[PDB]
Amino acid sequence: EHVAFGSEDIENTLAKMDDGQLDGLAFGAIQLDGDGNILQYNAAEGDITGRDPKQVIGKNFFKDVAPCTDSPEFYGKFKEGVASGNLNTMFEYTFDYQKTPTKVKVHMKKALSGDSYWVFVKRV
Numbered sequence: 001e002h003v004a005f006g007s008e009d010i011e012n013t014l015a016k017m018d019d020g021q022l023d024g025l026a027f028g029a030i031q032l033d034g035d036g037n038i039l040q041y042n043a044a045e046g047d048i049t050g051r052d053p054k055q056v057i058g059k060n061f062f063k064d065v066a067p068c069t070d071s072p073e074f075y076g077k078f079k080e081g082v083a084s085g086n087l088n089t090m091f092e093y094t095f096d097y098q099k100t101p102t103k104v105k106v107h108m109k110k111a112l113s114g115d116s117y118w119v120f121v122k123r124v
């Protein structure tokens with residue numbers, strides 16, 4: 001799937017993708033509901049993070065899978081965007097719960113579909 005991390009229209013392009021198409025992206029992609037529950041989780045994200053894309057669906061990202069992101073800098077930005085109904089933020093972050101500290105770039109962007117939000121990840 002020919003789509004770049006950070007592209008302006010990413011939410012329009014990713015509205016059409018099934019599981020298999022999301023798995024063809026060059027970067028990690030997670031779709032969360034407004035509470036942080038995982039709706040979609042692609043193969044590229046599992047390759048970066050070691051998590052099993054099949055097992056994480058239905059878990060809460062902030063409570064269960066990713067406690068290192070339960071902080072004002074990540075979760076706080078997420079919830080502020082859910083509350084406002086708009087979200088488009090990029091930042092760097094370190095993942096160090098199950099892994100050697102690993103720095104990534106994160107892009108969170110409200111989806112087109114209802115009650116859903118994207119978290120995109122790539123290595124830096």
Ligand SMILES: *C(=O)/C=C/c1ccc(O)cc1
Nearest residue numbers: 049066067068069095097
């Ligand atoms: C810190 O606990 C981060 C965990 C994490 C980041 C991204 C994922 O896709 C899965 C777990």
